[PDB]
Structure formats: C-alpha cells, structure tokens
Design a protein around this nucleic acid. Structure first.
Ligand SMILES: [Zn+2]
Length: 252
DNA sequence: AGGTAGATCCGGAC
DNA sequence: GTCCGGATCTAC
C-alpha cells in the first residue's frame, strides 16, 4: 500500500482495535520480526498490553500500546484484518495478535516482505526504522526551502532524491513519477540542476498529488499509451534503480 | 567524514 | 532463471 492507503488503514483500523488487550501473539514467519531479534521475545513482551492508539509516519504504522510501540511496514502487498479467533486464517497469514475478546489482528502478505519492530514507546522515534525518517509530505516541515537544501548538496537525480526516505517520508515510486509529470520535470535531471522556480513547482505538485489521494494516473504504468495532456506516447526507462515513467514532451 | 552504490529480503509473473 | 518494489545495512 502507498501512503494514502496507509492513512486509510490507520483511520479504519483504530476503532477496531483500540482498548483491546493482547492475550497471545502467534508468529508463523519469524523473519518478519526485526526487533527484538528473537521473535519469542517479541511475542512475550506484547502479552498483556492494551492497544491505545495508532499513528502513521510515512508508510509506517505505529501501534501504541501500554509500554511499547509496534512499528509495522506492509511494503507492497501486506494487509491487516480484524476477525474472529473461531474462523480459519486467510492464506499467507504470518503474524496474529490475539485479543482477550476472542478477536485477532492478523497480518498477511503473499510476498512475505513486511517488517515489525517493537521498542519502548519513548525509544521508537530514535531507533530503526523511524530514526532519520524525513518530514511528512503534507506537513509544513516539508517546504520548498528544505527540498532545495537537499537538492543542491547531491549529485543524484531528482527522482533518486525524492525516493530518499530521509528527504520526505514514504513518497513511493508511483507518486514520484506522477508528481514529476505534473511539475514538468524529467526524472533523470540532476537534483542540483533544478531552478528555484522548478523546486517550488515540484513541491507544489508533490503536496497536491499526495493530498488529493489522501483526501487518475498520468504516467505510471502507461508506457506506450498517449499522454493525457499532449498525446505523446509515455516512455519507461530505469532511473534510480526503478521503473520510471514520463512524457518526453511535457517533462524537461 | 560521510555520500552514495550495492546487497539483501520475497515470490508471482514473464 | 530473471525481474522488482521499500528501506535498511554494508562497504566503496
Ligand atoms: Zn505529455
């Protein structure tokens, strides 16, 4: 799920788990657990804690319990569901939190690619994976000045910069390509080559693109098809190690 | 020093 | 057999 989808999950999951107390934690693929390194320690420490809140930082969900925060990343295909302990689990379920009320919060992922870290609440923000995470793209902390400061300092392309989680939190491949299209900027441009005007426009489009989604595609996945704005066929290349889509007329 | 590329994890689709 | 997302860890 992309950032807007993580926000929807955050909003919808909260009322379904708040105030429930963990009675067991069952782990079917231990590699999902990244901290504590022992998945037995992970399961043991959560028992007896009640869910108090649910926050989002980039694409991370932060489950707030009594003493601990559980930091979860779903990557592309991870999903959470709340359901009865009496009913069979869905395929690819890797972690289940059992509540004292007979309900369960289940984590499933065909790709088996997500991560979970648990730390004392007060430590979560200064440890992996949240440590060093850049500002929320919809917050005033993400400003053109901040984007411009990072851009001038680097030899990397503008796409590489935007994909950097220390620059801006959880701006995925799809939103990078769409925002660069809307800003009229080629994804392979050196970030240091952007004018003040271009940086301002890019920040504007980034906020608008994410903002609209949190609250429909021009280029992503549309290679070989006409640009919706000018009719030029959309092209795909590799930039920053990623599938990268652009209109060669609209973007420069 | 520290910026930045490369390796790493996974499995459905090609 | 190779490819590919995100984000972190390793090493140039
Ligand atoms: Zn175009």
């Amino acid at each position: 799920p992309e950032l807007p989808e993580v926000e929807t999950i955050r909003r919808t999951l909260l009322p379904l788990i708040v105030g429930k107390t963990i009675e067991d934690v069952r782990i079917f693929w231990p590699n999902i657990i990244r901290h504590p390194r022992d998945s037995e320690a992970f399961a043991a420490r959560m028992i007896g804690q009640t869910v108090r809140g649910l926050e989002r930082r980039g694409k991370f969900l932060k489950f707030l319990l009594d003493r601990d925060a559980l930091i979860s990343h779903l990557r592309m295909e991870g999903r959470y569901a709340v359901a009865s302990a009496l009913e069979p689990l869905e395929p690819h379920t890797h972690v289940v939190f059992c509540f004292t009320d007979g309900s369960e919060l289940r984590y499933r992922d065909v790709r088996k690619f997500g991560t979970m870290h648990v730390y004392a609440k007060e430590e979560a923000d200064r440890r992996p994976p949240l440590a060093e995470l850049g500002p929320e793209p919809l917050s005033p902390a993400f400003s053109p000045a901040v984007l411009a400061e990072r851009a001038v300092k680097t030899k990397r392309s503008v796409k590489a910069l935007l994909l950097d989680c220390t620059v801006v939190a959880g701006f995925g491949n799809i939103y990078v390509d769409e925002s660069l299209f809307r800003a009229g900027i080629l994804p392979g441009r050196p970030a240091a080559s952007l004018s003040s005007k271009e940086i301002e426009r890019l920040h504007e489009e980034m906020v608008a693109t994410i903002g609209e989604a949190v609250m429909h595609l021009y280029v992503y996945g549309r290679q070989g098809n006409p640009c919706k704005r000018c009719g030029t066929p959309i092209e795909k290349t590799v930039v920053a190690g990623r599938g990268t889509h652009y209109c060669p007329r609209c973007q420069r």
